[PDB]
Amino acid sequence: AKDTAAGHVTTPCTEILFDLTLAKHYENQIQAAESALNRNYAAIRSWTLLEAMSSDGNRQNAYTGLIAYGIQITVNAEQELQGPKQTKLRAAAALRHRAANLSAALQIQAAQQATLTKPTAGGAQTPFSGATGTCKYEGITATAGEQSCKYSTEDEEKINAAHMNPEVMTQITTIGDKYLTTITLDAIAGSKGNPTQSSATYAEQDCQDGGNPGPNFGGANALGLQVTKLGTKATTEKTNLYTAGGTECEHQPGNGPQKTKQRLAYLVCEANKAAIITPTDLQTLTLDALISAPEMAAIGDALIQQLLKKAYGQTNEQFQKNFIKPLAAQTVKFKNTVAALMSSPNSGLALAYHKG
Amino acid sequence: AKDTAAGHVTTPCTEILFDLTLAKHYENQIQAAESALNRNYAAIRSWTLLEAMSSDGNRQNAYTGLIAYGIQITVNAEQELQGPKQTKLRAAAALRHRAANLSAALQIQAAQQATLTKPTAGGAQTPFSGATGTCKYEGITATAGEQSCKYSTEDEEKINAAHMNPEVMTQITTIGDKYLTTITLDAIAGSKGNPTQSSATYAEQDCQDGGNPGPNFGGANALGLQVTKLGTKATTEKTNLYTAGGTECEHQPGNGPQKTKQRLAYLVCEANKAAIITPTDLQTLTLDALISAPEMAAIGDALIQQLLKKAYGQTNEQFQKNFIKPLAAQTVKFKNTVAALMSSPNSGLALAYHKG
Ligand SMILES: *[C@@H]1O[C@H](CO)[C@@H](O[C@@H]2O[C@H](CO)[C@@H](O[C@@H]3O[C@H](CO[C@H]4O[C@H](CO)[C@@H](O)[C@H](O)[C@@H]4O)[C@@H](O)[C@H](O[C@H]4O[C@H](CO)[C@@H](O)[C@H](O)[C@@H]4O)[C@@H]3O)[C@H](O)[C@H]2NC(C)=O)[C@H](O)[C@H]1NC(C)=O
Ligand SMILES: *[C@@H]1O[C@H](CO)[C@@H](O[C@@H]2O[C@H](CO)[C@@H](O[C@@H]3O[C@H](CO[C@H]4O[C@H](CO)[C@@H](O)[C@H](O)[C@@H]4O)[C@@H](O)[C@H](O[C@H]4O[C@H](CO)[C@@H](O)[C@H](O)[C@@H]4O)[C@@H]3O)[C@H](O)[C@H]2NC(C)=O)[C@H](O)[C@H]1NC(C)=O
Numbered sequence A, B: 001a002k003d004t005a006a007g008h009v010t011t012p013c014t015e016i017l018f019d020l021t022l023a024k025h026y027e028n029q030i031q032a033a034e035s036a037l038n039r040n041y042a043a044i045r046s047w048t049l050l051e052a053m054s055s056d057g058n059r060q061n062a063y064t065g066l067i068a069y070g071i072q073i074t075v076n077a078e079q080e081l082q083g084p085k086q087t088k089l090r091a092a093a094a095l096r097h098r099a100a101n102l103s104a105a106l107q108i109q110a111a112q113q114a115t116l117t118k119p120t121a122g123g124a125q126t127p128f129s130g131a132t133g134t135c136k137y138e139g140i141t142a143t144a145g146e147q148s149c150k151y152s153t154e155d156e157e158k159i160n161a162a163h164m165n166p167e168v169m170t171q172i173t174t175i176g177d178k179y180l181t182t183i184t185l186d187a188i189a190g191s192k193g194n195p196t197q198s199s200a201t202y203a204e205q206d207c208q209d210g211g212n213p214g215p216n217f218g219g220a221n222a223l224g225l226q227v228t229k230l231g232t233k234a235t236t237e238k239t240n241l242y243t244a245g246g247t248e249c250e251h252q253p254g255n256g257p258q259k260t261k262q263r264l265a266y267l268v269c270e271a272n273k274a275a276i277i278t279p280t281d282l283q284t285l286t287l288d289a290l291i292s293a294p295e296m297a298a299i300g301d302a303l304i305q306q307l308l309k310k311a312y313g314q315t316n317e318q319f320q321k322n323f324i325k326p327l328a329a330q331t332v333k334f335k336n337t338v339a340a341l342m343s344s345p346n347s348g349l350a351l352a353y354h355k356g
Helices: A012-053 A055-111 A155-156 A261-272 A287-292 A295-302 A305-312 A316-324 A347-354 B012-053 B056-111 B155-156 B259-272 B288-294 B295-302 B305-312 B316-325 B347-354
Strands: A120-121 A131-142 A169-177 A182-192 A206-210 A219-230 A234-238 B119-124 B133-143 B171-175 B182-193 B205-211 B219-230 B236-240
Touching: A012 A055, A012 A155, A012 A169, A012 A347, A012 B295, A055 A295, A055 A305, A055 A316, A055 B056, A055 B347, A120 B347, A131 A219, A169 A261, A182 B182, A182 B219, A206 B316, A219 B182, A234 A261, A287 A305, A287 A316, A295 A305, A295 B347, A305 A316, A347 B295, B012 B056, B012 B155, B012 B171, B012 B347, B056 B259, B056 B295, B056 B305, B056 B316, B119 B205, B133 B219, B171 B259, B236 B259, B288 B305, B288 B316, B295 B305, B305 B316
Parallel strands: none
Antiparallel strands: A120 A131, A131 B182, A169 A234, A182 A219, A182 B133, A206 A219, B119 B133, B171 B236, B182 B219, B205 B219
């Protein structure tokens, strides 16, 4: 089942929810990858301190092996994140920009009831050079109270990051441009008798004179207008992310003018295709992941799997004991635990103290 | 001279420029601080490799001293950046959100000329139960072509990050809320003769019959209306950032409903007060900055200024020679330069190779 989330966009408010939810999904992908990097850098500082506290040459080289491995994979992953990060943030920014746009248009398109001003009566005058009576209104306004989008339980279940993996997204749905550009209104004129410039009784927000002027054109001669409603109807449109063959993004820029929906579809397509690679979590590393890691062959040689097990352990249970558990369990004292210490104000000073 | 930039905001387009320029200023402050951290972390990896390549105990401890110093100040600065980062990004996001809002409202407020539809003639009908003639229009619209903000040389000189240091900012200027909420229009009705439901000649986008219907109410009986212009005038408003005493932010939330301008002023105030502390640049460190650094007293003792000069040099010229120049000049070979190598895919492997 593809396009669960986009297929739930049927209104300005649900497009706003989709756009903000997808932007947050891209932002969270980046935050998760950067958190993984930060955890890895914290583990490298932890092993650096443990290396300095070792008195055994072979245990020292073991910590060195983990430091080298962690630096390699984490520096690489940080460099490889930058492209996908920029692509995903470009889309997140555009999606947030669009959601802001739609919400501002929603507020104006809610201004659906007019307040008339007191008119001024005339005879012929532009744009009615042939009239004998005119009734001129200046500064009619329409304003709505503060609007807000209300979402149901199902809106939040369907338009949800859980349904925004790249494998299920093939299109976006957007509100038509006229909602963002066009004022629409109905209006009606009414006449009775022989309205002229002397129809200057304005108590009913129209032009009356003669007889007994009052409600419902009470007077002999009357002219007026009313703006009976305003507001442009929202419509929805679909835009595909991919070409017909499904690999390539469909709406690449630089080929001629594009509509907002096409620019957004292109950015979303590129952000979906820009997959992030997260490196191994050093702080929860297992023995098998370490000796299976392609990078440890050249590292272990420099400092093969048989050798790695002799350095790091025959079971993961003792690998955990010797190399993982100390980060949160080994207490360091001088004048905190390892990993907290090496992410603290005294991190460098703990290292200097123990290398002497 | 305070408020050069805000005092140049006199139009929706210049408020948009101010809001986007200030958001970019906050974002650039964060990017600059994070670049400084990344440079420092790169220097720490560089000295780590040089430590591994040293055969001399005292030169090894010297590199260790720089590693410990760099870890201390850079980890601390990274932790201290997080609060100010969040505060500045909260303001940048809000400013961008506002600029999006204003730009969307600008497009709609540019829709200032109406297109009439063909009316339908009637007799009495709501909301003119007392009329003898009515002329009813449905779906009158107004749309503008695509609007764009054009800025002069001086607009870009005055509304500029160069004028957005916290010491010179005391207020923000914003467009009044009615620009974002209210449709405004003028309209006029015209009548001639005795218009009724038989005034059904619509060729002039009004209701005519009798005689020779045509331009300018050519016919005997005529009724019509025109919407002669639309668009709400932008006004500007000032909001102070600080209380009267000047220390505290003026528009703290949680004290009752606030207007957009007050929420923005509060965020800007907090972002201005959230100063970033950037640590020393390790890659351009001088001897005097090192031995003067408060952190090096406990570090040098562990591994006093007299001792530091004996370890790092009597002049900065030899400190540069021994500890700074090698990062970009010392070539490392095995089967690149130091600093590039230790930020490369082979960073960890270079370290492992040389510690053996
Ligand atoms: C860019 O333009 C958009 C569109 O105009 C603006 O979006 C509006 O922003 C305002 C302020 O955030 C929104 O108003 C807020 O709505 C919240 C939810 O409203 C409903 O739901 C609550 C229950 O959750 C009901 O109680 C309520 O009756 C509604 O049914 C309210 O909870 C907020 O209230 C808080 O602030 C107000 C005003 O300060 C106080 O009076 C309240 O006591 C309380 O403190 C608030 O009303 C509005 O809904 C948004 N509109 C849309 C269409 O999204 C952006 O603000 C604007 N951005 C910038 C930066 O300019
Ligand atoms: C949220 O809502 C806002 C407000 O509506 C939208 O902002 C508009 O965005 C569009 C598209 O970016 C802007 O249109 C662009 O304007 C550029 C500058 O226009 C002028 O200056 C150039 C010279 O620099 C003159 O040649 C030109 O005549 C104008 O005087 C143009 O350079 C852009 O042209 C490019 O795209 C168009 C359309 O695809 C092509 O036809 C062109 O050939 C060229 O490829 C473009 O016209 C518009 O100005 C913005 N309006 C405002 C008020 O800021 C946001 O787009 C919207 N955001 C989202 C994400 O929904």
